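Note to self: the last two entries modelled the partners one at a time, which told us nothing about the interface. This time every component goes in together.
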Amino acid sequence: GIRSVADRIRVRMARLPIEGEEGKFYTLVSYVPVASFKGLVTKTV
Amino acid sequence: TGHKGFSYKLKLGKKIHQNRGVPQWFRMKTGNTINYNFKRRHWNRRKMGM
Amino acid sequence: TKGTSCRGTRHNKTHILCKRCGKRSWHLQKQRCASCGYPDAKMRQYAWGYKALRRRTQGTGRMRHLKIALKR
Amino acid sequence: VSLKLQKRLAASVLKCGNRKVWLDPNETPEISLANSRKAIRKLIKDRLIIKKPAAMHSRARVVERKQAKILGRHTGHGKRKGTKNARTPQKTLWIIRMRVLRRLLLKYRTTGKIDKHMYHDFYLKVKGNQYKNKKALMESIFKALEEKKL
RNA sequence: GAUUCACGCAGUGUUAACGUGCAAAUUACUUGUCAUAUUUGAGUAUAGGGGCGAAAGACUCAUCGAACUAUCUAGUAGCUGG
RNA sequence: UGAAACUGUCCUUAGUGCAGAUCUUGGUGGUAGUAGCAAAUACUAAGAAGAGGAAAAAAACAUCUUAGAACUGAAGAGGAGAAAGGUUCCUAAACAACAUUACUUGGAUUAGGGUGAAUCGAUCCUAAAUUACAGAUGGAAAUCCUUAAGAAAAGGAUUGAAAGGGAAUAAGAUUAAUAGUUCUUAAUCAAGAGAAAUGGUAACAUAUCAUGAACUUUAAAAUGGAGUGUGAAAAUCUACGGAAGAGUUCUCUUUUCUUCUUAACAAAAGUAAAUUCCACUGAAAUGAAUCAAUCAGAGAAGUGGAAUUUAUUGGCUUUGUAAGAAAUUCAAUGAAUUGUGGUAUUUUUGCAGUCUUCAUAAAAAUUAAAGGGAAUCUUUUGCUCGUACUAAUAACCGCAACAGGUCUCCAAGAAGCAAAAUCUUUAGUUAAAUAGAAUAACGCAGGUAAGGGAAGUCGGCAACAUAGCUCUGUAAGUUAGCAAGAAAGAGUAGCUCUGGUGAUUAUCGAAUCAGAACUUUAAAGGUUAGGGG
RNA sequence: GUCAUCUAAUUAGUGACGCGCAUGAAUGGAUCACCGUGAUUCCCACUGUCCCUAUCUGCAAUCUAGUGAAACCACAGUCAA
RNA sequence: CUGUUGCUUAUAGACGAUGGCAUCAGAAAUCGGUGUUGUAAGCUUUAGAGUUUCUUAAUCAAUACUCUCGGGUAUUGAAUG
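The predicted structure of the combined assembly is written out below.
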């Protein structure tokens, strides 16, 4: 709902080239579901 | 109303017919000042009172 | 509630279009026209209403036949 | 583009509301050309327009509370909010009892257990609220018959 | 022409909000009332020293201790302003 | 600068000199880029169209589709009408102006399109009331009279209701928009055309039948309200058997959800409830019956009959219409299914008696019957007018897209005494006088608080507190009806059980009441919900 | 007004007294049971009314982009005598 | 030199201002310390008032036992790395 959000969220954002113009990039934030957030650090996939 | 007399309906239609602007060709006449119809009205602006 | 609130029920016409003078002055319950005095044979005119005389009288209309006669 | 005309026409053809109409998001150009009911009917046949299913409303919880109420699991004193006469009308209890007791008296008289004189006496006793239930009436009738035969 | 709740309705209190307002009288809670002396639509009748009034000089088109509109009328002013 | 009339002197004449009149009319400043653009819970992501999300976060981005999240909560922010509005209806192009930012949106601009009736209404009748010729009155305008005054009208003239009365139509489909109005199928109505009957004891009955004038009478149209009982239909709920589709599924769930329908008009396999009459018989030891009543020798109860009512024929199931329609699936136009019940709740529509009035709760058009006895199936046509749309937190009235006002119809689930509060399904909408950041004072709206408890104050103003149901208990006073829910006290949850209240003749069914072990965070209190003396 | 009573304290309330400025009998006198969004006083309970203020939330106010009025205004705007 | 700007910056704050760091900067996880609440979800877990079906084994059952001083939260204006 609108009144509550998860306490912690793990996301993966990937920088990809824009299809139209090759000079510029754009970010795509996606959702990575995990069972528990213990022992998870910032990983460059 | 949905229900109206015959004569009243015709006077409703005429008020519809008279709510038109100046045709473009009439506006091109020599020495013409009639560009806009100042007798115009719209349903939500002025009630024709009939 | 004598102002804004009381004007909610004004949806019943008192006057409708007259037949002799063409104005919305035909009183429905009184069965008379307040302007041209219909049923009455004589057109309703008053000397205190000098403007109402010049608004509707001879020469304020088409004069379909009189214009030929007077010029004749 | 604006598919407002197609959403309205589809609902009229599908006999649903505008909330149930599904217009394909990947075929906006094809739907936009459909400006008539004949074209919409063709699109429905091709499954470009789909009538969404109604939202599910399950009565499973209500049923399982009814069974618990049948066994008396929720009919306590802290769960009653209406008066005694509101929950069980006293007049209709009397209407049922008078129908039950007068049915029995009529059956006994026509069978032959009691005559018209003893049926008449027991009729006014029933109306006078003498017997609580059916069992109490059959007991008194049996007692009266034994006294008569003695 | 008993007691109460509800759809509705009114306007007891906050003398709350607002008070160049949502509104030329409204909003929120509280209170009262909520079918027979009840509530309500349409038609109809009653008009100016007249009407209508379970009576407040109340209501009679935001106008009433005498409506609105036009004529007498550029009413008169020993009073005020220029 | 301006581009066509003007000036000096003398007499004459006057609408002849402005800083004020809260002066009149027109224009314009400071205030001032200030006060504001804060009721109606709320928006987010991807994509499309567009000049119109750019960028050192310029943190916000109108319309449309999909997904998420939501609100109105079925006495609605739903689907339709009367009044009022009058083209606001539908579509396309286009956004200068208007909707307190913007708008590709619009009830806004431009151009087209759109309202189909023998059966719905107006038209017909009359109610309160209204208005004529003649007559009466008046100086006059005009007023009175509405059948009384008349050489007028068998009897009394005109108007007066889109909620009163009233000949006759439905289902499916169709349009960008109209549909008891169009199309298919199936009906109905009115006006026309081609010495005079039987049956039953009786109540009464017979696909037209089976003559029935003047005149008269009766009935219908046509009659308050309350409350209780009940017949039938629909909605919801539920029992048995399924057919098709959908949801959940690593934890279970023979599971949870949807569809399984049917018109006007007629038919008569089967079968109801209530009331009133008819025949036989004659009631006392008085009986018959209702929830209540109420009834009987001017004749009860019983048995056998007749009639009427029950949303068209004849009430319900059933049948024709009619499955060929429509709904749910499947295949790529063609294929499948469309049982039977309930001593349950609500709504609707009838019926039967009861209560109440110093209240008795319309008329006519129009129709039928009677008393009387004067006279001797097919087919044609059905004209005039309204019909679009809103009916309101944006189409009506308030200067407006104004939190004000405005008469109605249809009405799901939970829970509950309850159409209450709260949540949800069908339908509608996410926009409705702009947003983003920061999270000072003073505010408006909603709150809590140690110890004390009205010491505050004109005054317990405001707020707090009591609050449902069951059981016990209840004073003074009194018009003897009340006070009284007086006051006051106790109980209440969850789970597992036990017992009482019936129908059909062992099977079936209803929510209601009482009681007992055990457990815990010890139970009306989420919401609704008396402070008392 | 005087006497009681209510309170620690009573221009208040209630019960009495009555030569009553100027009460009094259908201008109705006396009397109150039920009733009252009527006027007044006292008890119980409860509490931010108060001792005596603390603190929480929403909408504003603050700043910004767009948009954007009005009342008022002789000229104006530091004091003492 | 100074100001803007960045840390959606703090010992500051309505806005300005003020204070600190600015590549040995900063930010974020995870992680240990420190707090709050009260013992997570599962099961072939042992107590369970009773009940049902088999024929005496299932099954249903408020609560309750072991795993479990568990699980969850913890700078957002907390302290380390």
